[PDB]
Design a binder for this molecule. Sequence first.
Ligand SMILES: C[C@]12CCC(=O)C[C@@H]1CC[C@@H]1[C@@H]2CC[C@]2(C)[C@@H](O)CC[C@@H]12
Ligand SMILES: Nc1cc(N2CCCCC2)nc(N)[n+]1[O-]
Length: 242
Amino acid sequence: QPIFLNVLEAIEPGVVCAGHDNNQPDSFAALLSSLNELGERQLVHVVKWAKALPGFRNLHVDDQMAVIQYSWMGLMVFAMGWRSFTNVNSAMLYFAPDLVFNEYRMHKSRMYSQCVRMRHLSQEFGWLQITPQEFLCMKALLLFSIIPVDGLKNQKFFDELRMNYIKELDRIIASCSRRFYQLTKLLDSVQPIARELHQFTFDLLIKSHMVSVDFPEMMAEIISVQVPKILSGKVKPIYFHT
Ligand SMILES: C[C@]12CCC(=O)C[C@@H]1CC[C@@H]1[C@@H]2CC[C@]2(C)[C@@H](O)CC[C@@H]12
Ligand SMILES: Nc1cc(N2CCCCC2)nc(N)[n+]1[O-]
């Protein structure tokens, strides 16, 4: 319909596999190493997605990387939750076609609770009958949903961008307002999830030698330089609802 929807559809990243060896048995080290690797792979695509987003180049260059660097966990969880929805109706987590988590992997990854949280999120796409277009605008909005408490290098450009992505979400919803409450509530629910994964990946990186869980270059860096900013409270999500 609009140029906006056109673009989100056009730029939506395709299939990313994890490289996981599905012949080897399930083990914390194998699974988490494959996850970390899927993380690196998807990071590459999120950067490119983000950069091709309407209005994105309005942001100051510093803010362009910051915003991505802070929001990846949520975008990735969110996108994954939708894959898990469309591909398997939320019965398992469809991280990638070569890394689908059944309950046994949920428990073997040592992230069962976090996993059940994501499965639930995935179910929400069903329970609310989220349209493919609702999904894409929502995921777009997620990128503008976490920021330093100090604001950004150029706070005004960000606010404008964030304002218009809200407007678009609203235009594509357009009592019809329970809809908006719900979706905004759905969006807020990504954040407590991402915070758990944040603490978890961080702890994991710290003891990563002691468990033989393997971290790739870009993952290690972001998790040690950027993720701690979030957990120390220097960077916080923007919630719709208090
Ligand atoms: C973002 C990823 C990787 C890609 C994805 O589809 C969503 C998923 C959610 C769990 C993350 C994982 C990357 C590796 C992490 C960060 C692990 O170290 C702990 C939790 C994992
Ligand atoms: N789909 C939902 C949504 C939902 N709410 C989402 C938004 C408002 C607060 C909780 N609660 C329940 N039980 N289900 O099944």
